[PDB]
């Protein structure tokens, strides 16, 4: 048995908040081109992967999985997690995407790379939805971990993962009842948050398709770890 199911709701939030990965910075001394911007984003994403992997270990219940299962969940959800972090950082910057504290981009700058403007608009749209919903950091760390455990749970060809997923649902509701929402408001806000996860998955898929074309276009040399993450989606 795992040590995650025994944690209280507040003990679940404290574990996720403390495990939160840091906000990294972009390479300094940058207008951008197609190659320079994708170079900055690749280097930033490659460095975030390493923190995410260690953030995943400190996620309650994730270490109790087999090493093969941990690889599968991360391989399928790595871009989703990166995007929901970007959307979270960009929340208090309407119309902009806070990739790094020294790399704030708008929709116009996404046009220097073909197909990036579509995903930019979806990422901005998600960020606007979080802002209008007034998403809290305690709710965000629950949503991110749900993405970790759920995005690859139906592709194992599993009872432990769904037990932890229910534990995070108990935690999410606990956060809403603690903030003062009525019972009807609790399950409505719950549903709205989880429905946005469908679009985050959509954004990851449309983005993954775009990242594989550029590795096939050789626009920027990608790292070995990032290529193993990309190849894991065929």
């Amino acid at each position: 048995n795992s040590l995650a199911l025994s944690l209280t709701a507040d003990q679940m939030v404290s574990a996720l908040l403390d495990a939160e990965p840091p906000i990294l910075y972009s390479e300094y001394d940058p207008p951008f081109s197609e190659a320079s911007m994708m170079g900055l984003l690749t280097n930033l994403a490659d460095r975030e992967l390493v923190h995410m992997i260690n953030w995943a270990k400190r996620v309650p219940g994730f270490v109790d999985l087999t090493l093969h299962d941990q690889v599968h969940l991360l391989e399928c959800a790595w871009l989703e997690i990166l995007m929901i972090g970007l959307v979270w950082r960009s929340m208090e910057h309407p119309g902009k995407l806070l990739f790094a504290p020294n790399l704030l981009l708008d929709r116009n700058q996404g046009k220097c790379v073909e197909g990036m403007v579509e995903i930019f608009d979806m990422l901005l749209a998600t960020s606007s939805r979080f802002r209008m919903m007034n998403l809290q950091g305690e709710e965000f760390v629950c949503l991110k971990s749900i993405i970790l455990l759920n995005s690859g749970v139906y592709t194992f060809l599993k009872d432990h993962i769904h037990r932890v997923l229910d534990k995070i649902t108990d935690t999410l509701i606990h956060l809403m009842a603690k903030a003062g929402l009525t019972l009807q408001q609790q399950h409505q806000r719950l549903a709205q948050l989880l429905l946005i996860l469908s679009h985050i998955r959509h954004m990851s898929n449309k983005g993954m398709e775009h990242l594989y074309s550029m590795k096939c276009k050789n626009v920027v040399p990608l790292s070995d770890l990032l290529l193993e993450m990309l190849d894991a989606h065929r």
Binding site: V50, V71, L74, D224, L225, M229
Partner: peptide
């Protein structure tokens, strides 16, 4: 084989 294996054990 995979780098993701190494980073998950360290």
């Amino acid at each position: 084989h995979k780098i993701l294996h190494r980073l998950l054990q360290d």
